[PDB]
Design a binder for these strands. Structure first.
Ligand SMILES: [Mg+2]
Ligand SMILES: [Mg+2]
Ligand SMILES: [Mg+2]
Ligand SMILES: [Mg+2]
Ligand SMILES: [Mg+2]
Ligand SMILES: [Mg+2]
Ligand SMILES: [Mg+2]
Ligand SMILES: [Mg+2]
Ligand SMILES: [Mg+2]
Ligand SMILES: [Mg+2]
Ligand SMILES: [Mg+2]
Ligand SMILES: [Mg+2]
Ligand SMILES: [Mg+2]
Ligand SMILES: [Mg+2]
Ligand SMILES: [Mg+2]
Ligand SMILES: [Mg+2]
Ligand SMILES: [Mg+2]
Ligand SMILES: [Mg+2]
Ligand SMILES: [Mg+2]
Ligand SMILES: [Mg+2]
Ligand SMILES: [Zn+2]
Lengths: 53, 122, 116, 110
RNA sequence: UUAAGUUAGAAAGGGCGCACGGUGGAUGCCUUGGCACUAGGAGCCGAAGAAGGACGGGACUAACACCGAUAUGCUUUGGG
RNA sequence: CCGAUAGUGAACCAGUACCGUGAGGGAAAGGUGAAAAGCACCCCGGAAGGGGAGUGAAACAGUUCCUGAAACCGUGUGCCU
RNA sequence: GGUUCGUGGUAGGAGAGCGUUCUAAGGGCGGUGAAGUCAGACCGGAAGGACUGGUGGAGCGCUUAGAAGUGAGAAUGCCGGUAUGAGUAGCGAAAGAAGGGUGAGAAUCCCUUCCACCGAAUAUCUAAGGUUUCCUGAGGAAGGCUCGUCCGCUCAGGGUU
């Protein structure tokens, strides 16, 4: 029900070892020349890097 | 099949609404989960369209929404979503066996991080 | 006249917290647990100034025992021998010879054997 | 040699800003800006404006080479907390901390 | 090369030390306000409408202070 | 005698705010600088907020702004794991 | 000055002292940097005291006496600040969708269409009660359990015959 003891700084920090973001999966486009998510449409060019729209 | 955080009747309503939107506008932006369900339902409506006969028209009519796409002017008469499906959309896919839709991944929505996509006829 | 509690309190508590330098977590930060930790450290250090003297005599005796058994004497026989011989060299000096100048230790071990 | 920007008393919780700022620390500014663009978090837009401000400072004030810049330092300090109350059951009110952040980004040549 | 043996190094994260920040408002210095008294004065106001108020009054006026449809002031005597 | 948790409840528009049907209960809250000289102008930004430039003895004195402890939150790293 | 015997200690008795604010008197320090504050490997048997350097920016020691609001770690103490639990519980009955628009920015604001819900009400009056919440134009700090270009919110004007 309730914490028996307060959690120490060390223990709190150990618990948060896995609470983090991963870097996004991105890469530079050829036509744009700027970063884009893989398998997404590149807004800089304004279409899908390969398939023209 | 996907339950889209909706009861059975709510989900049928949603699928009919989006199906009609994609037939009317030919390109809509929605969530990935919705798009992956819509492709199944829209490609079956286009199949009915390709079949073309009265029985298929009435099967489509049971699903498609009674929406006016446009007014053509001959007198001026409206064009209904069902008419567009059977007179405009269906014929353009006469020689194409399946795969009437495509889903382009767009990116996450600001307010809920929902992964948004374009689904379009082609 | 009023005496407000200014500075003397902070000065006293900060000294105790500085004495708890190196202690784990709250023990080097917070006066209440630092003050316990410092009191306890002082109590251990007092106890261990006595225990240190016992510990080093046990180390020396063990080394004298090892070096004496290499001369076919036990520690108990060698020390008896040195007493009878009249040799007053203390265990810290014997242990030092047994590590650093074994030749000299063997000379004393001979003096012990002779007295026995 | 280096250029800094700060966003003081931004109305976002420090923990929420830090989990993002940790991605861009040590990265080249081009990659850093990309990482923020494609990290879907409330903090990403705020940190982007601080970083682009720091880059503008580096280019306009100190005449550094923008193509050559790296995020030397990035950190989030606690700002002053807004104290609020949520009414709970049985007449009791529970505290709500509307925490704020000071977001610092330093950029440097290499 | 094989075998047997020995020893190094590592950090997802953490600890200690140090440096630099943030938060926070302790401490010091300060005083617009208080506290206790002393000496002197004064110890009542009101139907000639009191104490205390309400609403108003300014070029624009929300508040305070001041004033009362003569309203952010009027007459007069002195001071300056 | 007190020196802002003190001294009046009240150094600050306080018997106010606020609580209570009402009688009644009843706070918190002082300090830019000698002087506003209160940051022209440029830059990023919708703004906020910054970075320069300038004022100043000082701006790490920047309109709540003398000092600025501790808890607490971070960044960096010498030794350890 | 030696000699001899002593020097564990709760309640408790006895003694000597440290430090704090104020006063007096002597004598000083201080913009060539006071108090405070931070740091340090210094000094004394203890309480404690210096020195040096940073910060600070104007007051403060010392000696001898005097007087006390004179020393805090505990009171489920009082007030303030900040943790922990934790990115956890929760986000308060319910159907939404897409297109178009606005905007720095849109699941959340506006418009359109379809869908869905109440319908002896979830509709229309009206008393009480509230007291400007009403309308229009600006706004987006805070409030709104998210967002916000929007609002019963903020700022202006208005409005009740
Ligand atoms: Mg049903
Ligand atoms: Mg209730
Ligand atoms: Mg008071
Ligand atoms: Mg103070
Ligand atoms: Mg301030
Ligand atoms: Mg004794
Ligand atoms: Mg004894
Ligand atoms: Mg006594
Ligand atoms: Mg003093
Ligand atoms: Mg201080
Ligand atoms: Mg006392
Ligand atoms: Mg306490
Ligand atoms: Mg849990
Ligand atoms: Mg859970
Ligand atoms: Mg949940
Ligand atoms: Mg709700
Ligand atoms: Mg009924
Ligand atoms: Mg309205
Ligand atoms: Mg909000
Ligand atoms: Mg609006
Ligand atoms: Zn591209």
């Amino acid at each position: 029900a309730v914490p028996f003891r307060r959690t120490s700084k060390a223990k709190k920090r150990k618990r948060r070892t896995h609470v983090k973001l991963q870097l996004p999966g991105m890469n530079e486009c050829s036509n744009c020349g700027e970063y884009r998510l893989s398998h997404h449409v590149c807004p800089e060019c304004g279409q899908y890097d390969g398939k023209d729209v | 099949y996907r339950k889209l955080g909706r009861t059975s009747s709510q989900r049928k309503a949603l699928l009919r609404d989006l199906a009609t939107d994609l037939i009317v506008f030919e390109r809509i932006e929605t969530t990935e989960a919705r798009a992956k369900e819509i492709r199944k339902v829209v490609e079956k409506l286009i199949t009915s369209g390709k079949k073309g006969d009265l029985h298929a028209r009435r099967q489509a009519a049971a699903f498609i929404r009674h929406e006016v796409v446009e007014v053509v002017q001959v007198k001026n008469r409206p064009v209904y979503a069902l008419q567009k499906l059977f007179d405009d959309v269906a014929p353009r896919y006469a020689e194409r066996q399946g795969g009437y839709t495509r889903i382009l991944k767009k990116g996450p929505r600001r307010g809920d991080g929902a992964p948004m996509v374009i689904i379009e006829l082609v | 006249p009023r005496v407000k509690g200014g500075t003397v309190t902070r000065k006293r508590r900060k000294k105790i917290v500085k004495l708890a330098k190196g202690y784990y977590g709250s023990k080097h930060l917070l006066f209440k647990v630092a003050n316990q930790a410092v009191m306890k450290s002082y109590q251990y250090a007092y106890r261990d100034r006595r225990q240190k003297k016992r510990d080093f005599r046990r180390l020396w005796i063990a080394r004298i025992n090892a070096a004496a058994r290499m001369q076919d004497l036990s520690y108990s026989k060698l020390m008896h021998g040195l007493k009878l011989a009249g040799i007053d060299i203390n265990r810290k000096m014997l242990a030092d010879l047994a590590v650093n100048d074994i030749a000299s230790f063997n000379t004393l071990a001979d003096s012990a054997k002779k007295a026995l | 040699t280096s250029a800094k920007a700060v966003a003081k008393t931004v109305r976002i919780a420090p923990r929420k800003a830090r989990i993002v700022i940790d991605l861009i620390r040590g990265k080249q500014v081009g990659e850093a800006i990309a990482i923020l663009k494609y990290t879907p978090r409330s903090a990403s837009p705020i940190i982007e404006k601080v970083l682009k401000s720091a880059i503008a400072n580096a280019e306009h004030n100190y005449d550094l080479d923008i193509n050559n810049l790296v995020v030397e330092e990035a950190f989030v300090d606690e700002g002053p907390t807004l104290k609020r109350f949520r009414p709970r059951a049985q007449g009791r009110a529970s505290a709500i901390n509307k925490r704020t952040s000071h977001i610092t980004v330093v950029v440097s040549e290499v």
